[PDB]
Design a binder for these strands. Structure first.
Lengths: 34, 187, 124, 104, 49, 52, 225, 147, 49
RNA sequence: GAGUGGCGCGGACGCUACGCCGCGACGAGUAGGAGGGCCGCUGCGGUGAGCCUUGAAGCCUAGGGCGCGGGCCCGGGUGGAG
RNA sequence: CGCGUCCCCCGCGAGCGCACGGGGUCGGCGGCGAUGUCGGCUACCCACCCGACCCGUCUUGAAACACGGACCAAGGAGUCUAACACGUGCGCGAGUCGGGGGCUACGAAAGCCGCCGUGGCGCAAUGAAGGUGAAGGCCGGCGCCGCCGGCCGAGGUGGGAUCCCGAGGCCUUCCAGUCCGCCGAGGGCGCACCACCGGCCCGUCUCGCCCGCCGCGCCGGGGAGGUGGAGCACGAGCGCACGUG
């Protein structure tokens, strides 16, 4: 679908921060090796 | 020792699209399955048309998809093009349009959807209608391309309205000896 | 999706290995280990992997979960089965058939686990 | 340095490789080369066909009722036959069913 | 834009929308079958006549 | 000799044209030169407009 | 429930068994009917010739409705008209055979290729061996061997030719559906004549094999089949 | 890409796909458009009729600025002024026609090709066709001339 | 992550994500800070490769 | 097809879909055309957690083979850095 | 080879077993087996039998008493550039393209500008040119008028892949009977495209008549019918890459 999930953000220690970004629609753009 | 001419043995249709683009190749897999496992001949034509070259699937403009869907017994029907749907700027009124096309130009999207029309793709067209029941299958003009004006009978040979290959058209670029009775002759 | 990222991986993946009129896939979850839409262990939601245990004897069953499929660490859950040659093959038949978990890989996995059990079984 | 002047030797062999094609047998011949006094008049015959259309939709629809007054007002051996009757699943459906039940 | 929006045709081709309006799979493979002469073979003759 | 149906054209390559070929590998280095000669101009005329 | 669906699937499986056995008895009784026809056909030909000779008059029997045309000469150095007629008779390969019904239109096609064919009026047993052994079917433009009755029935059933014996009947007794039965048969791939040809080049009248052989094609059919 | 070319399939083959009888000789019909009237008369007649000879008046110092007169039709005239005007001038009851300056959009003449949608316009164009006037007047509008 | 493994990048211990880090990685001025980052995010096995 | 009335926890192979499979017919060939090369040479971006002083390239071979073929893979010797 | 029934003369038995039955198996066997034998087609040498002239080339025809070639290694010949045509792949699509310019190790790269889209080709043709420059029927006012109106409206025909409607039909000691699923008598809407008819725009010729008007004439537009055009008739181009010529 055009579903944009909630992509977390990681602190330098390797643990997940409480601040989260909606996956930009760039990442669901058509996968074209051509 | 059999007298068969093997001149006309290898048929020159297409078995697959020359395009290596995956989305169009994933669509072929979906219509290979339908062309054979449905009794429908819609799915035979749509499969055959996905293989075709750019020149063989021309852009059907919006105004034809207005015109060829205003016809009787074509109401509440989905217009299917295997080419593209380009926006025609010199048409004002745009009805509700259930349309399937491989591409639609973003200005035609802008036009069709705002008039409460729905745009599907060929994966959705299969879910809407596997056999293609209640679909208007259209194509744009295939003597559309300006290339076809140069074809046919020889330009310089009588009753030929054929466009000659000239570097540039003026008053002195292929106008005299073949084209006038005043010059050598007129065809 | 599964079918989309196959049409990329099918010819130009790093695991892909072509020589001697043969094609394989050196993926960490391909079992039968051939370049195939069925057995590719990167592509699908559900991925049964069978590997030799980190210890001497036993076979691990690598189960790929439902949730984290964009999550390369929290994805794969591993379970080591150090039992007899019957109820290691049985555990794997029970993990797949009776969970409805990728039942295409029900017999392909048991021929593998058997051949791992056959490998860590000394010579005379 | 004389040469061969002319021949038609290999030509019949060449003409039948794509076939001696008979010309494009199409309906509606063009009105090209028709005498331009006749063609003026036929062009005027098509020009004013609209003139007698209220006469036409009347006359061609009174002949439609004339089909409702004329069609509404209108109204080798024996042994192989009994087998051929039985041996196919439309006319020998119940006939096979009475053979099958007749072993009691 | 996407040329096709759902690319998971694992899901499409076995979804009940398509699965109603197929025809049945003809998976019975038919290999070549030998001829037998009527002079040589009796119970190949009795199959025909 | 012309083959078939095809455009009539007169290629202007009858001179010793290969001696006087101007190749544009200067271009990406020229734009660096023109830019450094434009900033160092503007840095001289310090409060004045740079277009002038 | 499935108490029905077990019993329902058996009844339909039973219904199709008794549908076979009803068709099977028809194929027998149609074949037994033909054994009477061929007896009555064979005997009336002799009968008419006896009541002629008793009177002292002559019984001229009917000019034969059916020929069997075998190609004998090769594919190299053949005239273009003679190429065309051979490939309208479906004789595209040396020692190919096809059944050709005689009329005015077909004998003039069989006289124009007289060097390149060995033709004649075939026997009832000559028709038998060609349709059983060498009998192949043109099903979906594929030379599929006539091994079962449900190949001829599949293609020729609409003309009520539902078995091999119906086809042999349609060939030998040139019926109203001879065209659809003859064109169904693939042109018969006969072997070289076992014993040797007399003289390929010349006509049969001048000690050759090229052209007409009235009852004498049957001597060469068994030589080749 | 040389590997994809034809020369790569002609290694081994002697003539290199240019005939064994008639050798690949340098210029066997002359260089370029040689023999246009002589030995290439048929090519230059069959596909390039009018090539040889003069026609019409020479015009020595011709500039392509004086003869500049680009045309819009009445077909795509409503593309030049935004969608916001066309709906407002249709919706409004006052009968005020929106002015379409054609010189602004880049065109100097309005030709009358298309079917103009039935609401009054004002066209401030430089040149006009007769049919172009009739359609603007027919719908019910003004053909304003401009300099 | 299927295509990134099929590319060949060692991504096996990447904890989750198309990986997004906090904005105090822009503020780094030494490699020892930057190496000890890729240890924690478990992308160091891609440089060890 | 479907409605409503009158004990045993079991079942091989598969399907790189550019794959797999089945049935028929056919296969000369200069000039010439097109296709397919997991044919071959040299550099480049990727990639194989590739190979290599426990011996790279090369070169020789009455060694083992493979491919219809182009060619290639190994064994042995030689060699010294890819 | 039943009975319970419908006329003219006299709807599932229950098993077995053998098999000329949609391409071979044996549930049959016996020998020899460590420095003297076993297999290894291939590859080394050799012999016999049949076949077998020396390649390349131009040529109607070469083993030629045609020419090049004693032998071996290495080198050695359809390239690159511009232009054009067509095919094919990609992107956007009445547009499209920054290619020149400017902005901000690899990087001389890449990213960006839109009041940098000038400009290129495309969207309009035609004429030497001045120029001109691409649908209309009818229905009312003035059996008719220019014209005040008036709703309506990019053709027609024939063939057309597909779609649509469906007279009726597709079963289980059974009868109505709803719902889906599907096929077909027959009927239509008909994409592309082709053939034909119309129309439309420019050039030119014949015909004939009306109109406009700050400027009435060597003015301006209009009409009918033939005819010339590389045109219109609800856009397909542009850029990029590849192939071939």
């Amino acid at each position: 679908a055009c579903a944009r999930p909630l992509i977390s953000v990681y602190s330098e220690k390797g643990e997940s921060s409480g601040k989260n970004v909606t996956l930009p629609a760039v990442f669901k753009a058509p996968i074209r090796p051509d | 020792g059999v007298d068969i001419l093997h001149n006309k043995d290898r048929k020159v249709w297409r078995k697959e699209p020359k395009s290596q683009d995956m989305y169009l190749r994933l669509l072929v897999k979906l219509y290979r399955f339908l062309a054979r496992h449905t009794n429908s001949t819609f799915n035979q034509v749509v499969l055959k048309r996905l293989f075709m070259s750019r020149t063989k699937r021309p852009p059907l403009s919006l105004s034809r998809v207005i015109r060829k869907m205003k016809l009787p017994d074509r109401e509440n029907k989905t217009a299917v093009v295997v080419g593209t749907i380009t926006d025609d700027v010199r048409v004002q009124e745009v009805p509700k349009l259930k349309v399937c096309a491989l591409r639609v130009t973003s200005r035609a999207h802008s036009r069709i959807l705002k008039a409460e029309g729905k745009i599907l793709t060929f994966h959705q067209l299969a879910l809407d209608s596997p056999k293609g029941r209640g679909t208007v299958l259209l194509s744009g003009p295939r003597k559309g391309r300006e290339v076809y004006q140069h074809f046919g009978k020889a330009p310089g040979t009588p009753h030929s309205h054929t466009k000659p290959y000239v570097r540039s058209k003026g008053r002195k670029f292929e106008r005299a000896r073949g084209r006038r009775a005043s010059w050598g002759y007129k065809n | 999706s599964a079918h989309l990222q196959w049409m990329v991986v099918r010819n130009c993946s790093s695991f892909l290995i072509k020589r001697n009129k043969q094609t394989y896939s050196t993926e960490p979850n391909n079992l039968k280990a051939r370049n195939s839409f069925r057995y590719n262990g990167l592509i699908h939601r559900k991925t049964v992997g069978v590997e030799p245990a980190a210890d001497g004897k036993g076979v691990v069953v690598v189960m790929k979960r439902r949730s984290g499929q964009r999550k390369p660490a929290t994805s794969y859950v591993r379970t080591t089965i150090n039992k007899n040659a019957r109820a290691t093959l049985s555990s794997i038949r029970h993990m797949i058939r009776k969970n409805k978990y990728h039942p295409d890989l029900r017999m392909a996995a048991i021929r593998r686990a058997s051949a791992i059990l056959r490998s860590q079984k000394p010579v005379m | 340095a004389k040469s061969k002047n002319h021949t038609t030797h290999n030509q019949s062999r060449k003409w039948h490789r794509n076939g001696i094609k008979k010309p494009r047998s199409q309906r509606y011949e063009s009105l090209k080369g028709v005498d331009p006094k006749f063609l003026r008049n036929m062009r005027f015959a098509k020009k004013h066909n609209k003139k007698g259309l209220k006469k036409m939709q009347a006359n061609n629809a009174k002949a439609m009722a004339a089909r409702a007054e004329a069609i509404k007002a209108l109204v080798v051996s024996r042994k192989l036959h009994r087998l051929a009757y039985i041996a196919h699943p439309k006319l020998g459906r119940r006939a096979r069913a009475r053979i099958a039940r007749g072993l009691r | 834009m996407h040329k096709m929006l759902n690319t998971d045709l694992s899901r499409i081709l076995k979804s009940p929308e398509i699965q109603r309006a197929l025809r049945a799979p003809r998976k019975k493979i038919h290999r070549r079958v030998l001829k037998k002469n009527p002079l040589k073979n009796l119970r190949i003759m009795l199959k025909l006549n | 000799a012309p083959s078939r149906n095809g455009m009539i054209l007169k290629p202007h390559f009858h001179k010793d044209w290969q001696r006087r070929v101007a190749t544009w590998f200067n271009q990406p280095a020229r734009k660096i030169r023109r830019r450094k000669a434009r900033q160092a101009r503007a840095r001289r005329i310090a409060p004045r407009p740079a277009a002038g | 429930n499935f108490a029905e669906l077990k019993i329902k699937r058996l009844r339909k499986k039973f219904a199709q068994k008794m549908l076979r056995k009803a068709r099977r008895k028809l194929i027998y009784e149609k074949a037994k009917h033909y054994h009477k026809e061929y007896r009555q056909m064979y005997r009336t030909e002799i009968r008419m010739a006896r009541m002629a000779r008793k009177a002292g008059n002559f019984y001229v029997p009917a000019e034969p409705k059916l020929a069997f045309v075998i190609r004998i000469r090769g594919i190299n150095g053949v005239s273009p008209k003679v190429r065309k007629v051979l490939q309208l008779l479906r004789l595209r390969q040396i020692f190919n055979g096809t059944f050709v019904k005689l009329n005015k239109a077909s004998i003039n096609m069989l006289r124009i290729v007289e060097p390149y064919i060995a033709w004649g009026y075939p026997n009832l047993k000559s028709v038998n061996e060609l349709i059983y052994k060498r009998g192949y079917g043109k099903i979906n433009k594929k030379r599929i061997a006539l091994t079962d009755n449900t190949l001829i029935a599949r293609s020729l059933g609409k003309y009520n030719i539902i078995c091999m014996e119906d086809l042999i009947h349609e060939i030998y007794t040139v019926g109203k559906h001879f065209k659809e039965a003859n064109n169904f048969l693939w042109p018969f791939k006969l072997s070289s004549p076992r014993g040797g040809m007399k003289k390929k080049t010349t006509h049969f009248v001048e000690g050759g094999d090229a052209g007409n052989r009235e009852d004498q094609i049957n001597r060469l059919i068994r030589r080749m089949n | 890409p040389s590997r994809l070319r034809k020369t790569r399939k002609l290694r081994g083959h002697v003539s290199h796909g240019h005939g064994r009888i008639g050798k690949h000789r340098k210029h066997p019909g002359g260089r370029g458009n040689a023999g246009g009237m002589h030995h290439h008369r048929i090519n230059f007649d069959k596909y390039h009729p009018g090539y040889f000879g003069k026609v019409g008046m020479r015009h020595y110092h011709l500039k392509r600025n004086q003869s500049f007169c680009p045309t819009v039709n009445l077909d795509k005239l409503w593309t030049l002024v935004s969608e916001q005007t066309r709906v407002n001038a249709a919706k409004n009851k006052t009968g005020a026609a929106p002015i379409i300056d054609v010189v602004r959009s880049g065109y100097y003449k309005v030709l009358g090709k298309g079917k103009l949608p039935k609401q009054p316009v004002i066209v401030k164009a430089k040149f006009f066709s007769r049919r172009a006037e009739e359609k603007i007047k027919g719908v019910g509008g003004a053909c304003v001339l401009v300099a | 992550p299927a295509l990134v493994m099929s590319k060949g990048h060692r991504i096996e211990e990447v904890p989750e994500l198309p990986l997004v880090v906090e904005d105090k990685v822009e503020g780094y001025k030494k490699t020892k800070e930057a190496v000890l980052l890729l240890k924690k995010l478990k992308a160091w096995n891609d440089i060890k490769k």
